[PDB]
Assembly symmetry: C5
Amino acid sequence: VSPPPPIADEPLTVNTGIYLIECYSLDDKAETFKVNAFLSLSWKEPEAIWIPEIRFVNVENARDADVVDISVSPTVQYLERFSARVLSPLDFRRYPFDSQTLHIYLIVRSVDIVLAVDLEKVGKNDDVFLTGWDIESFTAVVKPANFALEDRLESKLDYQLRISRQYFSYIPNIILPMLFILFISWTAFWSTSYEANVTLVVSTLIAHIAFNILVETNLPKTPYMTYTGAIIFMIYLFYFVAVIEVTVQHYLKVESQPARAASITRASRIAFPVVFLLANIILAFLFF
Amino acid sequence: VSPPPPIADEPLTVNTGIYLIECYSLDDKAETFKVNAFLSLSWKEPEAIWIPEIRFVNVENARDADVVDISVSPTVQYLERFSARVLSPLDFRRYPFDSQTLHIYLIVRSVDIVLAVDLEKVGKNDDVFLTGWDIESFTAVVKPANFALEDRLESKLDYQLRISRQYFSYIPNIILPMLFILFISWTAFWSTSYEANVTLVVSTLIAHIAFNILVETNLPKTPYMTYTGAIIFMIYLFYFVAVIEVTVQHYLKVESQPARAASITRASRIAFPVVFLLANIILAFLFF
Amino acid sequence: VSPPPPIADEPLTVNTGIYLIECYSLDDKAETFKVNAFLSLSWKEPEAIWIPEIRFVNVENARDADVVDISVSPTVQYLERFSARVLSPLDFRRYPFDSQTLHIYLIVRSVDIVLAVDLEKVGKNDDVFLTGWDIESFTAVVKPANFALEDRLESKLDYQLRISRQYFSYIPNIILPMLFILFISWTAFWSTSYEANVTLVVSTLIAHIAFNILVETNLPKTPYMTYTGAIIFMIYLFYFVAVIEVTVQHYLKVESQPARAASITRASRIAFPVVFLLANIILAFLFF
Amino acid sequence: VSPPPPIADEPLTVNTGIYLIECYSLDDKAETFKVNAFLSLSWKEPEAIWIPEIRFVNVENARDADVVDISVSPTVQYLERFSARVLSPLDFRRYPFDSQTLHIYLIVRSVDIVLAVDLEKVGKNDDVFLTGWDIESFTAVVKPANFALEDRLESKLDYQLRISRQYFSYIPNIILPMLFILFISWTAFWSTSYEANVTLVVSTLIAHIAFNILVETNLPKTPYMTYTGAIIFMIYLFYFVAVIEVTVQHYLKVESQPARAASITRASRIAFPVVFLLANIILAFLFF
Amino acid sequence: VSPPPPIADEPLTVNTGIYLIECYSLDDKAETFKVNAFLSLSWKEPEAIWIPEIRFVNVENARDADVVDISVSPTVQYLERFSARVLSPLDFRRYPFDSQTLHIYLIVRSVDIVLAVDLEKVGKNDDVFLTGWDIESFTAVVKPANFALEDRLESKLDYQLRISRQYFSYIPNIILPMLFILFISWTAFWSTSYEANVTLVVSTLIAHIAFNILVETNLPKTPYMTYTGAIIFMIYLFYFVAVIEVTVQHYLKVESQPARAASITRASRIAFPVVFLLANIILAFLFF
C-alpha cells in the first residue's frame, strides 16, 4: 500500500518502456492520433505491490488502462495494455514530404521518483508496422525542462517517434494530375482561335478547382502555408497569367498587329514551361 | 472533511490559477473548443484536506479531472490536470481578420468562499504556443453580475484569452484566388466576340461557385453576414452585372449601334476595377 | 430519506423552473439540440433532504446532472446544473422563414406529486442570448394528456420555447444568388446565336447544380418538400423550359420562319420574369 | 431476490410490451437507428421485486435503462424508459419506394422463463408519429429458431415494425430533375450544329455528374444495385449513346451523306423518348 | 474465487469459440470494424465459478461485455454477449476485387492457461449473413509467435475470417461510367473542328474530375496506390495524350499539312482503344 521505504536516494529508477501494438488512428484533422499499445514498468494482482501511477501529459481523456501481467521476482515486472489518444501536434509544413515527430510525454507523480527507460523493452513491433508511414528513429529523453509551472522539480521522460510519409503514392495521385491540368492549359498557346483558347483555359480552370476539391477531401488544411498551399497558389497565378496572355494576343490580333501577336505567342510558349519549372524550384528551395 | 472553521470573514481567497497545456481542438462548427490543461488552487492524497470544489459554467460535460499534486505546507497547493470542452461562443464577425475572445467562467460553491487569482501561476506555456493563432492578452476578472438567477450573492472569476488569427495564409489561399477568378471574368471585356465572352464569363462563374465550395469546406458558416459573406455576395453581383453588360453590348452590336457599344465597353473596362475597389473599401469600412 | 408524509393532498406543488445558460448546439441533421443549463426546484448536501427525482421525457441519454446548491429555509431551494441533448423534433416546413417550437417535457415520478412552475425562476438569460435565433415566447403548460400508456394519472409540465430564425443573412447568401444565376440564364433570350445561347443556359445550369451543392452543405434535407425544396424545383423547371424555348427558336430559324421566331423570343422575354414572379407568389401563398 | 418459486410450469408468461416514444435517429449510413422509448413488463423501488432481466439482441452497446415505475398489485407492473441504438439491417433494395422492416429481438435469461406480449401495452404513440415515414404494421412473434448456438431452448419474442417511406418528396427532388437534365440532353437532337450539340450534351453530362453528387450527399450507398443505382446507370448509358449518335451524324454530314444523317436524326428523336420509357419500365418490372 | 488447483499440467484447454451475431459496422476510413457477437467458453451467476478472463489484443476500448448464461454440469459452459470495435487492418490493395482477412487475436492471462477452440461452437450465423460481403473461410490458429515483448511464453489463438467483396455492383456503378466518360472523350477524334474537339475533351475532363469526386465520397483513400489509384491515373494520362493529339492535329492543319493530320487522326483512332486495353491489361497483370 506504500512504496518501498528504505533507500538513501529519494527517487527510484523504475524502468519505463513502451512497445507499440496498433496505431488505431492518425487523425490529421483532429491533430491527434489514437495509439493502442502496452507499457512495461519494472519496479525494484491489481494491488499485489505499489504500482507507481506514472501518468501522461499529452492525453485527451484519461488513458483506457488494463493491467495485463504483474509478475514478481526475488524486482517486479508490470505490463499493462492501454488505449489513449495522444494530443501531439504535427506540423504539416511539407505535406507530401514530411518528417513529423510524434511525442509522448510520460511523467511520474512523486511521494515520500524518477522515470527511466529499458532498451530491450522499448521498440516498434515488426508485425505492427504502420500503414502508410515509415519509422526513422524511436528514442527517449529525460528532459526536466518540459514543464515549469510546478515548483517541485519533475522530469518528463518523453518518447520521440520520427515518422516520414511514404510518398510514392502522392506523386501519382495528387501532384501529377495538377501538372497535367496545367499542361492542358498551356496547350492552348499553340492554338490560334480565341473562341477555342478561351474555353481551353477556363474549362481547365474549372478542372483545377474541382481537382483541388478532390485533394481537399484528403488534406487537413493547416493554417500554415503548405508546400501544397504554394503550388496551388502558383497554379492559380499561372492560369491568370495565361488568360492575360491569350487576351492580349487576341487584342493585338483584332487591332491589326499580327507580328507582335506571334512574338508574344512564341515567347509565352517557350517561357511558361521554363518559368514554371524555375518557380517550382524556387518554392522547393524555400521549402527544402 | 470540513473547511477550516475559524475565520472572521465568511469567504476565503483561495488562489485560483490556470496555465494552458494543450488546446486539443478549436471546433468552429461545434462553436466550442476542447482545452486540456491543469489548474492550481492555493487553499490556506485525494482527501488529505478539504478541496474547494470550484466548478465551471461553460462546460459541455463534467470536466475530466485528475489530481496531480496536493502539497501541504506550514497553506496547501493543489494542482490538478483536467480536460474539458468549454462552450464559449466566438463571433465570426470577421472570419479572415478576427479578434475572438475565449472565455472560461469559474465559480466556487459556498458553504458555512470567494475565488481569487495568482499572477505567477497563470500564463500560457511558451512550449504550448497555439497552432495558427496568436495571443494578445490573458487576464482574469471577478465580475459577480455574470449570473443573477440564484438569490445568494456569487462572483464568477472568469478568465479571458484574447486571440487573433494568423492571417498570412488566408490572403494567399482564400481571398486572392477569388480575385483571380473575378479578374479572368473581367478580361472578357477587352474581347469582342459574343460566343467567346459569354463562355469566358459563365464558365468562370462556374469557377467561382466551385471555389466557394472549396472555401465552405473550411468555413463554419455562421448565421451572421460575414466579411466573407459580403465579398462573396459582391462577386455574385459583379458577375451578374458583367453578364448584363456583355449582353447589352451584343444587343447594341446586332441592332447596328457600334458607337454606343464601344462606349459601353470602354466605360465598363475603366469602371469595374474602380467600382469594385470602391465597393470593397466600403465593405471594409463597414467591417472595420 | 422519505418525502414529507403529513399532508392531506397526495401531490405537492414543488416549484419547477428552468433558466437557460448556453445552448451548446442546435443539430439540424441530428434533429436534436444540446442544452446546457440549470434547473431550480422548490420543495416545501446531496442527501440533505428528499429530492423529487423529476425526470425528462425528450432525452437522448440520462441527463448529465450536477447539484449546484441545495439551500434550506424555515421550504428548500435546489438548483442543479445539467447538460442534456433534448430529442425535440423541429419541422423545417419553411427553412429560411421558420417558427420552430422547441419542447422540453418534464415529468415527476410519484410515490406515497404534481409538477409546478415559478414565474421568477424561469426565463432566458439576457447574456445567454442565442446566436442566430430570436425568442418569441417562453411558457410552460401542465398537460396531463401527453402520455397515456401508464394507467396511473400523470401530468407532464412541458416548457415551450418559440424561436424564429434571423433571416437577414439567408436572403443575401442563399436565395438571392440563385435568382442571379436564373437571371443570367434568362439573359440568353435577348441574344440570337444558338452556339452562344445554348452554352449560356446549360453552363448556368451547371452553376445552379453546384450552387445547390453549396446550400446542401448547410441544409438538413428534411423528407418534407421545403419552401427551398420548391424554389429549387421551380428553377429546374424554368431551366428546362428555357432550353425548350431556345431550341424551338433555333428550330424555327433553321426552318425559315423568322417571324414566329422573333415572336417567341419577345413573348418569352416578357413572360419568364412575369411568370416566375407569379409562380414564386403562388408558392409563397401555399407556404404562408 | 429470487423469482417466485412455486409454479408447476418452469416458464412464466411475463407480459412484455413496448410503446414507442421518440425515434431519435434513423442512421442510413450507420445502418442502425436510435430508439428512445419505454418498455412495460407485467410479472405475476429498484429491488422491490425480482425483475426479469429481459435483454436485447440487436443492440450496439448495453441499453441506457432507467426505471420509471414499478407498481405492485394484489401481479406487478414495471415500466422502464430506455434509449438504445438497435442494429437492425434495412435493405435499400428500392430506395425511393421502400418497405423496410425494423426488427427488435428481445430474449429473456432463464434460471430455476418465456417472453409474452400485451395487446394493450404495445402500440406506436400517435403524438410520436415518425417524421418522413409511415407505419403499416406493428406486430410481435415468438420464434424460438432465431438463435441456435445455445443448446438450451430459448425463444426470442421479436417485434416487427413495417415502415414505408413517404415518397411525395423524392419524386420532385431527386428523380425528376435527373429527367430534366436528360431532356435537355435530348434537345440537342433537333439542333444541327456540331459545335452546339457537342456542348449541349457534354455540359449536361457535367450537370448529371454534379446532380449525382447532390443526391449522393443524401443516399447511403448500399453495396447492392439500387433502383437508383440502375436509373443512374441508364442515364450514363443514354448520354454515351447520345454522344455516339451526334458524332455519327456529324461524321456522315462531313462525309457528304446528308440523307442518312437526317434519317438518323429523325430515328433517334422518335426513339430515345420511347426506348428510355421502355427501359425504365423494364427496370421497374425487375424492381417491382 | 480461484482456478481449479489439482491438475498435473499447468495450462487448461478451456474451449474458446466465437459465433458472429451482427457486424454492426465496417468502417473503411477508420480502418476498423465494429463486431457485436457472443463468445462461448467451456471451463472444465457472475461469480459462480472462476471465469478465465480471456482478453483481446485488437481492441479499441475495453470490450462491452455482458454475461448471458453460465451453465454448470457434472464441466461448465459460459456464453457472454459482447460488442467491441476490433482494430484489424485491411489492405485495400485491390478495392473493387478484394480478399480482405479480418483478424481477432484472443489471449488468455495465466496464473498459477492455454486457449483452445470448439468446432461446433464457432461458425457464422446463416441469418447473420453479412451485407455486401462473402465469407470464404472462418478458421482459428494457435500461433504463440504473435507477441514477443513478454518473456513468459503466451500463445494467441487468433480467429481469421477471409472475406471477399461482392463486386457485381462496383462494375456498373464506379468502373464502367469512367469508361463511358473516356469513350465520350475519344469520340472527339472522328470529329474535325478544333472549336468542338477542344470542348468535347476538356468538358469531359471536367466530367472525370467530378466523377472521381463521386467515387471518393465512397472510397477510403488508402496511402497505397490502389487498382483504382492506377486506372484513375491512366485516365488522366489518356486525357492529356488526347489533348496533345488534338492540338497537334490542329497545329498541322493550320500549318498546311493535311495529309499528316489525317494520318495522325487515323492512327490515334485505331490506337487509343487498343493501347488503353493493353494498358488496362498490364495493370491487371501487375495487380493480379
